[PDB]
Amino acid sequence: TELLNVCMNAKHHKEKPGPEDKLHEQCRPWRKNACCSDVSYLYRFNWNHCGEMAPACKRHFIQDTCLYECSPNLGPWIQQVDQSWRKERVLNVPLCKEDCEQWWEDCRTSYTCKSNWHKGWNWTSGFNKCAVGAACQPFHFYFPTPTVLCNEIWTHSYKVSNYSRGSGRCIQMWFDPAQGNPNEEVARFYAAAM
Ligand SMILES: *[C@@H]1O[C@H](CO)[C@@H](O)[C@H](O)[C@H]1NC(C)=O
Numbered sequence: 001t002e003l004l005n006v007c008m009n010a011k012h013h014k015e016k017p018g019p020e021d022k023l024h025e026q027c028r029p030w031r032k033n034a035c036c037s038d039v040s041y042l043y044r045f046n047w048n049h050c051g052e053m054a055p056a057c058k059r060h061f062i063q064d065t066c067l068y069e070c071s072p073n074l075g076p077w078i079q080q081v082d083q084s085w086r087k088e089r090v091l092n093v094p095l096c097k098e099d100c101e102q103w104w105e106d107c108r109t110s111y112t113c114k115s116n117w118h119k120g121w122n123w124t125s126g127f128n129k130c131a132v133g134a135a136c137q138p139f140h141f142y143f144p145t146p147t148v149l150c151n152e153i154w155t156h157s158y159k160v161s162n163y164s165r166g167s168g169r170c171i172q173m174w175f176d177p178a179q180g181n182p183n184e185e186v187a188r189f190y191a192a193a194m
């Protein structure tokens with residue numbers, strides 16, 4: 001029960017969700033019941049480290065960001081001993097297959113310089129830049145399959161699932177809250193599994 005409807009904040013204290021803050025207004029699905037209620041990757045992470053990121057690609061990263069900072073349904077995957085992330089450390093979140101497949105396809109035309117986006121950046125300038133010796137290449141050079149993209153980009157925060165949206169066994173990065181949060185059932189399912 002402790003694993004359900006729970007947030008870890010930027011001081012690494014567990015706290016309840018609440019109405020979404022102003023900074024996360026674009027995180028629509030979470031307007032009612034959010035952990036984002038700053039350290040936000042809505043602006044503190046340079047998506048354009050290798051030229052302009054394509055808008056179709058950038059959308060997925062906004063979703064990814066919203067899910068990480070706002071979702072009260074990642075409790076089963078939160079590693080409480082790890083306080084090294086800006087908020088929670090999650091491990092092997094069962095991301096829905098098509099969310100990962102779409103994200104991969106949509107980022108084909110963008111570029112990046114490394115596979116693990118959680119470490120190894122140069123931050124000297126006040127924002128993240130590719131380090132000396134990290135060559136910009138097509139996105140799929142660093143992420144040749146949706147599996148490598150989803151599993152490696154945030155160092156195993158996600159583990160892409162064989163399940164698809166609607167199964168109740170995978171976490172999706174976005175949804176229409178007017179028909180309820182579909183990740184709620186998934187958290188409860190894995191809380192029980194554990
Ligand atoms: C960090 O940024 C600047 C050049 O971009 C430089 O002072 C330093 O060498 C950089 N660090 C590395 C190894 O990229």
Ligand SMILES: *[C@H]1O[C@H](CO)[C@@H](O)[C@H](O)[C@H]1NC(C)=O
Nearest residue numbers: 097160161162163164167169
């Ligand atoms: C694959 O994932 C699990 C693990 O084997 C399995 O139980 C499930 O039936 C499969 N999912 C689907 C529907 O492909």
Ligand SMILES: [K+]
Nearest residue numbers: 071072073183
């Ligand atoms: K959620």
